Design a protein around this ligand. Structure first.
Ligand SMILES: O=c1cc(-c2ccccc2)oc2ccc(Cl)cc12
Ligand SMILES: [Zn+2]
Lengths: 47, 161
């Protein structure tokens, strides 16, 4: 596992082409996330 | 020490979590190759994950980050999709859940789009799809995502395609 950039605690990946995409994020310490909810689902076939 | 508590579909907390799941679906540039073709989900269950030790581990680190960033943890709720959800909920996130080859280096990746995390439920690029039918677009097999509390603190901004 890599390190955060110096002076930072995470990385934000900002979308720069796909105008509809939301952001992605990276942390480098497992202690910086807590899995609050487990969601069980199926994807639905469009009609 | 982990226990899972089911939420009633009548519970406001069930409803706000489902809405964040459904409303952050988007179309992907792979036309559905990795994650399947869909505009929405059928939510089968939402469980609250309770583990005292893992939570205190999180809040300890959260306070360290906050005191390094003018008392601002910059906490978000974000999706995470992985073949290892059952190890995560019992033992916490660690180096074995990192995406070694990701665009931003070896770390633990989280998404605002639930449909982005869905591309990783069955592995990188969707792996070989569901274990039963080998179908990355299976409409039958049950999938799991985590909705996670994440401390970003001071985040390095990377512009990207
Ligand atoms: O939710 C994700 C899980 C994973 C993931 C990666 C390797 C192993 C397990 C899960 O990859 C992602 C990459 C980018 C974004 Cl934005 C989200 C994810
Ligand atoms: Zn299947």
């Amino acid at each position: 596992m890599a390190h955060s950039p110096p002076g930072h605690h995470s990385v934000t990946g900002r979308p720069s082409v796909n105008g509809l995409a939301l952001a992605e994020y990276v942390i480098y310490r497992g202690e910086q996330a807590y899995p609050e909810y487990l969601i069980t689902y199926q994807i639905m076939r469009p009609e | 020490g982990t226990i899972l508590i089911d939420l009633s579909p009548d519970d406001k907390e069930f409803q706000s979590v489902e809405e964040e799941m459904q409303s952050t679906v988007r179309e992907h540039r792979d036309g559905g190759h990795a994650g399947g073709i869909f505009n929405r989900y059928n939510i089968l269950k939402i469980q609250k994950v309770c583990n005292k030790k893992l939570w205190e581990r999180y809040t300890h680190r959260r306070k360290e980050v906050s005191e390094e960033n003018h008392n601002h943890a910059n906490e978000r709720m974000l999706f995470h999709g992985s073949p290892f959800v059952n190890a995560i909920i019992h033992k916490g996130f660690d180096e074995r859940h990192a995406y070694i080859g990701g665009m931003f280096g070896a770390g633990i990746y989280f998404a605002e789009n639930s449909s982005k995390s869905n591309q990783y439920v069955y592995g990188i690029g969707g792996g070989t799809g569901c274990p039963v039918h080998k179908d990355r677009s299976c409409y039958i097999c049950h999938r799991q995502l985590l909705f996670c509390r994440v401390t970003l603190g001071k985040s390095f901004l990377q512009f990207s395609a």
